[PDB]
Amino acid sequence: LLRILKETEFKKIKVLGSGAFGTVYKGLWIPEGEKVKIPVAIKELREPKANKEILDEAYVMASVDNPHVCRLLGICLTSTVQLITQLMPFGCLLDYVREHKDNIGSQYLLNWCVQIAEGMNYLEDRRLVHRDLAARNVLVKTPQHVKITDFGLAKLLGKVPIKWMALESILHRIYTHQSDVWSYGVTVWELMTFGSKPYDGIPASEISSILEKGERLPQPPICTIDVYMIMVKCWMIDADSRPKFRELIIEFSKMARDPQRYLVIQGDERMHLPEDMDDVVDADEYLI
């Protein structure tokens, strides 16, 4: 299922941006021997493991079959490790809610939670942990369908997200699904503050402390107590007490049936949102 690419079988066209370790390019996968050109997004990882191992990990990242968990399509092992995945046209859901603050309504926000949760639940059911789930790691296929990206990358690359990590992770470097729910909670806080930065104004080396003291992210304005409390119930000190993703998917799908009742957005009733040539095949289309 994992396709091994030659540095020739693809070409980085643009630089969509660089995050943690490496940079992301908008490229095109040209399967040697076929006129077809598949739009993809290439990620080149900045160089303590070996190449024979990396492979065994990819084999597993390119095994996650689910509508909300972005799957690995191929890998390119040379002087650098390059990951090939289907190209997501609308960008990270973080940059989305920022440039659309006033235009995103109840129904949508709530759905995304429900989707992201479905993704996290997928991985959970397989005893797989993400570790770096954040608003910046959920791409938008379409404004109505989002999906989690960069799973297993963190495990593959050893600056760590302190604000998104659960306490025990920060203190004892212990990552479990139970921590991922903590990550989720923050991610959800991000969407609710339409992209606002968490604990902004506090220094990472200090988070650990203000957290122990029982201080958590603030209740967004648009969030009716009932919603804020699920997020908050994800940041409990006692991990095994945090909501499992299944519990979330529900508590959250149950609010999407009447969005306006759990989210108070001004002017919700009136809101709306949205290269070619020929031989452009969708990743979907090429990998039957």
């Binding site: 606002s196 201080e215 958590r216 603030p218 409990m236």
Partner: peptide, 16 residues
């Protein structure tokens, strides 16, 4: 909105 909201002395959110 303020950066942090307290939850103490709630034993559930304050470690000891």
């Amino acid at each position: 909105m303020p950066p942090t909201q307290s939850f103490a002395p709630d034993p559930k959110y304050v470690s000891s």
